[PDB]
Amino acid sequence: TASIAQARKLVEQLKMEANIDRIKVSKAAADLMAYCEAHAKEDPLLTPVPASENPFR
Amino acid sequence: ELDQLRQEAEQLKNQIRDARKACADATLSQITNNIDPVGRIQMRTRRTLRGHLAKIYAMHWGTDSRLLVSASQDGKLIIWDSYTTNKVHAIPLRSSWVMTCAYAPSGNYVACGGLDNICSIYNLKTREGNVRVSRELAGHTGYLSCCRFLDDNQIVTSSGDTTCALWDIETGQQTTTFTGHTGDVMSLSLAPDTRLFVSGACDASAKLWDVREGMCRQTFTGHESDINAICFFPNGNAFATGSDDATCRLFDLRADQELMTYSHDNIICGITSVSFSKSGRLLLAGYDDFNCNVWDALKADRAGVLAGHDNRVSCLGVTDDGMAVATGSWDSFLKIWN
Amino acid sequence: SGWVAAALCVVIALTAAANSLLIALICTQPALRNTSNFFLVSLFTSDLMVGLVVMPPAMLNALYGRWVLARGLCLLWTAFDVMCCSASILNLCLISLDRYLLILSPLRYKLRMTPLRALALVLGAWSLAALASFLPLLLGWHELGHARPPVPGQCRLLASLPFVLVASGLTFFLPSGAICFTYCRILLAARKQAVQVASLTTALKASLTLGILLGMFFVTWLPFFVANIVQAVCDCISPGLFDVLTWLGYCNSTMNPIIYPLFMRDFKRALGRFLPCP
Amino acid sequence: QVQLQESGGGLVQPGGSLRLSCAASGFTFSNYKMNWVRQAPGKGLEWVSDISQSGASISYTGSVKGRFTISRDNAKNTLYLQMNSLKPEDTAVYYCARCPAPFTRDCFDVTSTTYAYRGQGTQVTVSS
Amino acid sequence: TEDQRNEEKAQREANKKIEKQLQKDKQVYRATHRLLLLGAGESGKNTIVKQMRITSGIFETKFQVDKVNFHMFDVGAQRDERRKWIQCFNDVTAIIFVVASSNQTNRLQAALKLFDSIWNNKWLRDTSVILFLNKQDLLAEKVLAGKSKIEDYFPEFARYTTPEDATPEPGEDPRVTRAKYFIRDEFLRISTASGDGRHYCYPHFTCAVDTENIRRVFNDCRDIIQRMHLRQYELL
Ligand SMILES: NCCc1c[nH]c2ccc(O)cc12
């Protein structure tokens, strides 16, 4: 009973996974950059911040 | 018939593989070649916190980048002031074997758990002048590995029994549970909107869950060993995972496939913890070889190394505003890098 | 001579540099902060103070050949030298006792040795050395000793049989016997444990360690004390040899601080982490 | 996804020989230790034999030492277990399991009744 | 600055109080020894635990020997997998491993494999393991009864010879002693093949109902800590 129930649940999960919307990798990659260089101006780690406002010294 | 179901599963897996392949006309690595490399990154320890006696296993940054909570296997939970290094609380835990800790978004509650299978929540109101256990959430059949707060009243916890559950603080009983995993669940991460959260298990597969609907949405695989860490990309549309195979991978929910993988031939130790910067350009991952590395997510080039720790780097965290990065290790010391 | 002057200058410079480096390395690192290391840091501080106080006047007198300071200052310098050597020997004995307690009783070490106890022992040893050095000066027991030859203008240590015998005994022989007994027990335990380990199936190193540790101290210190005893009976001997033996004892004081770090792997790893990077 | 598939095996009279082959995919076969386990009917899982990454070190259980043999070929990501001189107690389902972590000689959860990093296995039966 | 100083002084006072509390707790933390109890599924761990004593995921037992604090933890409701939660017990003084010397399968082989895995673990290489060979009395009966198990599943036992270093007790036949020392040597081979020297094994032949088990554990812990101290002082 347990084995057949687990197999049926796995098949149902696979069926659900096979019926979902998917987007092209290219647009996702473009969006990643659109976010990256959009927020690059608020990255103290990416670009060092002077001691005038840095709380760690 | 078992043979029929196990063959239908193989057919469905093959169909899913074909569908995933059909969408991969190009790779993120090829496109990113036009991006300017960040270059070498210089980081130094600005603050060192001492007071722990045993190996530190977990820590969590606050929502104001001011207070952080540190959990050690000594049975002591300490809250530190990052700027002044002044301890604010010292909570003696009932069980010394801790494995995770969490800080409520409002800062009014703190939670921790471990091998006792019980999640304990502490209240910082201190009406009587002392911190006491608000409530204990028992019910897990396996060691509690990680926990996170959706809000002051909702907490998500994970245990090493393949079950992830959502708990109501007031009532103190599970509201919904997830049973899609097969191996022990190591870590979980909450999305910025809190609607979705991912979890890694000791079976090389990462599962995406819907908090409201309470069931799996997507499944990700590709790792060669157990998953030890997971963290969402700042935009919330992707996440990165670390595994014992010493290679980090980035998964995108929209594409349902891994976009890039970070690896180095000279590195053989597994990844313990991972975290992204505010913009997500820099990926920080801890390694068992007594140091941490910073990876350029877009170019997969190691931009620096943090080697200020003497023992295994168990935990790693980046402030909400990205002012500084706090890391912990088994030497009972915390290093804050900026 | 110029060559001997340069040799003494470099020796004292090395002593000061090594002592300062050891003290700084111990203090800066919290990992090395331990109850056992309290005795070691006290000994290193004592050695630094010896090098700062007693060595320069001694080398100046040796080079010039005449005392160019006050006679009372010479008396104070001799008393300080006596106290310095007694305190160094007592600190070495306390370190040996602490190692004995740690080895022969690890589980009971915490109960039988607390930081308060270590501080009390260190203070008691320092007070005992100060008393043994200064009491004859304060109460003037030196006058009772008529064996002292008349001073020819160069002030030197007293040699009356009673005081010299009592001081040398109490400050060198009993600590030496205690150290020998401690290290003999340590060696016996080590050999027992080595044979126990070898009893399982699918030595010269520890012997060399303890042999070096004991032999350096004995070979360096015993000659000076036997020379002092020889002086006690007013035997004829060249003063140059006595000065050479005293400078050998000072070289022992310089050498002792740097041997121990090489023989404790905690200090070895600390040095490996700190010194190579510069 | 990482998948381990067992092949070969079947009904054979005592005293015969059988060839069992394990197919590995989705991971670097040369960087992981390989183990063989079996589960007789009505009994729990039990370890049989294991082979190092390079094959230099090979060990077998006492009940099967000197009878069976195992080998690996990283060029094909295949693992083999040669069986000869079958006995009536040899009947059991054989699983091909992989050591959880690479570049290590320790393997903990190979046979703890829930190991995910093992194949489906094949049925081995012996009768007169 | 007055308002800022008001908060700074309170922060300093809180830090001082927390430091005092941590210093007080440090003495008790350092003065107690942590131990891990482990063994096979149906081993005699329970009987030994009750002897020392006289849904939770972990059980803890406290006992004192010669005014020495000892704290032991027994794994409770935990899943069969061990490669993840075992890493926590890497700072304990020693690991107590109990294996029965006898659903049942070739338990001894599984015990050997588990011991090898524990010994070869990277994080456990610094921790010594105390080995208890339990159910020796039952092994004696099984050997004297004629029906045998080791000679059947262990072929090397036929060619084995009793070591000259053996010190068997009176009143026991050569067969039981030979089997016991064969098992002991099987364990020692695995524990000594590495030859690292950082950690060592302490085999013991103990019955389920044994009064002096506490003394065995105390002696093993004393030896382990003392050996660590000699290693620290560069002797060993
Ligand atoms: N320079 C050796 C000072 C000294 C130390 N202890 C002593 C005892 C007796 C004595 O005459 C002299 C000393």
The 10 Å Cβ neighbour count of residue E197 is 10
The 10 Å Cβ neighbour count of residue B151 is 12
**Angstroms from E171 CA to nearest CA on chain B:** 46
Do the strands D3-8 and B315-318 form a parallel or antiparallel pair, or are they unpaired?
unpaired
CA distances from E37 to E34, E60, E98, E129, E131 (A): 10, 10, 8, 10, 10
Domain E31-232, second-level architecture: 3-Layer(aba) Sandwich (3.40)
Q: How far apart are CA C27 and CA C33, in angstroms?
A: 7
Break chain C down into helix, strand, coil percent, rounded to 5. 80, 0, 20
Coil vs helix vs strand at B34: coil
Q: How far apart are CA C20 and CA C258, in angstroms?
A: 11
Ligand 1 pocket residues where CB is under 6 Å? C 81-82, 85-86, 157, 164, 167-168, 171, 228
Instruction: Quote the tokens at residue B313.
Output: 């780097």
What one-letter code names the amino acid at E150?
I
Closest CB from E201, E232, E235 relative to C266: E232
Q: How far apart are CA E214 and CA E205, in angstroms?
A: 13
Query: What are phi and psi for residue E78, nearest 5 degrees?
Result: -130, 150
Q: How far apart are CA B79 and CA B122, in angstroms?
A: 12
Residues 89-128 of B with CB under 8 A from A: none
Would you list the DSSP string of E68-120? EEEEEEEE-S--S--TTGGGGTTSSSEEEEEEE------HHHHHHHHHHHHHH
Do the strands E128-134 and E94-100 form a parallel or antiparallel pair, or are they unpaired?
parallel
Q: Are B228 and B200 in contact (CB under 8 A)?
A: yes
Quickly list H helices, chain B.
2-22, 28-32
∠ CA E147-E153-E159, nearest 5°, is 95
**Angstroms from E219 CA to nearest CA on chain D:** 29
CA torsion, points C5, C7, C13, C14, in degrees to nearest 10? -170
Question: Looking at the 3D structure of chain D, how many domains does it have?
Answer: 1
CA torsion, points E135, E140, E142, E147, in degrees to nearest 10? 150
Bridge-partner residues for D51, per DSSP?
D34, D58
Q: How far apart are CA C176 and CA C169, in angstroms?
A: 10
CA of C85 to the centre of ligand 1 (A): 7
Residue C152: is it exposed, middle or buried by C-beta count within 10 angstroms (0-12/13-18/19+)?
Answer: exposed
∠ CA E13-E19-E25, nearest 5°, is 140
Quickly list H helices, B119-225.
none
Per residue, the 3-state secondary structure of B260-276, as one string, reads EEECCCCCCCCEEEEEE
What one-letter code names the amino acid at A12?
E
Q: How far apart are CA D90 and CA D92, in angstroms?
A: 6
∠ CA E42-E47-E48, nearest 5°, is 110
Bridge-partner residues for B207, per DSSP?
B199, B219
Residue the block writes with tokens 């700062």: C52
Chains interfacing with E (3 or more CB pairs < 8 Å)? B, C, D
Residue B16: is it exposed, middle or buried by C-beta count within 10 angstroms (0-12/13-18/19+)?
Answer: middle
C116 touches chain E (CB under 8 A): no
Closest CB from D66, D100, D113 relative to E80: D113
Would you list the DSSP string of B203-271? TSEEEEEETTTTEEEEEEE--SS-EEEEEE-TTSSEEEEEETTS-EEEEETTTTEEEEEE--TT--SPE
Query: What CATH number did the domain enclosing D92 receive?
Result: 2.60.40.10
Residues of chain C contacting E231 with CB distance shorter than 8 Å: 265
Q: Are B112 and B102 in contact (CB under 8 A)?
A: yes
Give Cβ neighbours of residue C148 (< 8 Å, ≥ 6 apart).
Answer: C142, C158, C159, C160
Give counts: helices (H), strands (E), chain C.
11, 0
Coil vs helix vs strand at D93: strand
Bridge-partner residues for E74, per DSSP?
E37, E59
**CB spacing of C202 vs E189 below 8 angstroms:** yes
Resolution (A): 3.3
Give Cβ neighbours of residue C133 (< 8 Å, ≥ 6 apart).
Answer: C79, C80, C82, C83, C86
CA distances from B262 to B246, B248, B285, D89, E25 (A): 9, 5, 10, 48, 43
Give Cβ neighbours of residue A57 (< 8 Å, ≥ 6 apart).
Answer: A51, B46
Contacts 24+ apart (CB under 8 A), C77-81: C77/C53, C78/C155, C78/C156, C78/C157, C79/C133, C79/C134, C79/C137, C80/C53, C80/C54, C80/C133, C81/C54
Instruction: Quote the tokens at residue B174.
Output: 């599970």
What one-letter code names the amino acid at E86?
I
Q: What is the DSSP letter of C30?
A: S
Question: Looking at the 3D structure of chain C, how many domains does it have?
Answer: 1
Residue B38: is it exposed, middle or buried by C-beta count within 10 angstroms (0-12/13-18/19+)?
Answer: buried
Q: Are B56 and B76 in contact (CB under 8 A)?
A: no
**CB spacing of E83 vs D46 below 8 angstroms:** no
Closest CB from B183, B221, B268 relative to D103: B268
Residue of C74, C168, C244 to mutate, ligand 1, most atoms within 8 A of C-beta: C168
Q: What is the DSSP letter of D116?
A: S
Residue the block writes with tokens 């040996």: C96
**Strands lying side by side in the sheet with B315-318:** B45-49, B334-337, B325-328, B315-318
Instruction: Quote the tokens at residue E141.
Output: 């009966």
Instruction: Quote the tokens at residue C175.
Output: 């600590």
Domain boundaries, chain B: 2-337
Q: For residue E182, how far is the Cα from the chain centroid?
A: 20
Q: How far apart are CA B296 and CA D101, in angstroms?
A: 27
Q: How far apart are CA C98 and CA B96, in angstroms?
A: 32
**Largest Cα–Cα distance in chain B?**
66
Which residue has its alpha carbon closest to ligand 1 atom 11?
C164
Residues of chain B contacting D123 with CB distance shorter than 8 Å: none
**CB spacing of E84 vs B55 below 8 angstroms:** no
**CB spacing of D62 vs E156 below 8 angstroms:** yes
**Strands lying side by side in the sheet with B205-210:** B185-190, B196-201, B205-210, B215-221
Domain containing residue C53: 1-278
Q: Are D38 and D63 in contact (CB under 8 A)?
A: no
Residue the block writes with tokens 């107590």: E96
Contacts 24+ apart (CB under 8 A), C167-174: C167/C82, C167/C86, C167/C132, C168/C225, C168/C228, C168/C229, C170/C132, C171/C85, C171/C86, C171/C89, C171/C90, C171/C129, C171/C132, C172/C89, C172/C221, C172/C225
Closest CB from B6, B26, B336 relative to A7: B6
Instruction: Quote the tokens at residue E105.
Output: 């399968």
Answer yes or no: CATH 2.130.10.10 is held by domain B2-337: yes
Rg (CA), chain E: 23
The 10 Å Cβ neighbour count of residue C19 is 24
Residue A51: is it exposed, middle or buried by C-beta count within 10 angstroms (0-12/13-18/19+)?
Answer: exposed
Q: How far apart are CA B247 and CA B243, in angstroms?
A: 7
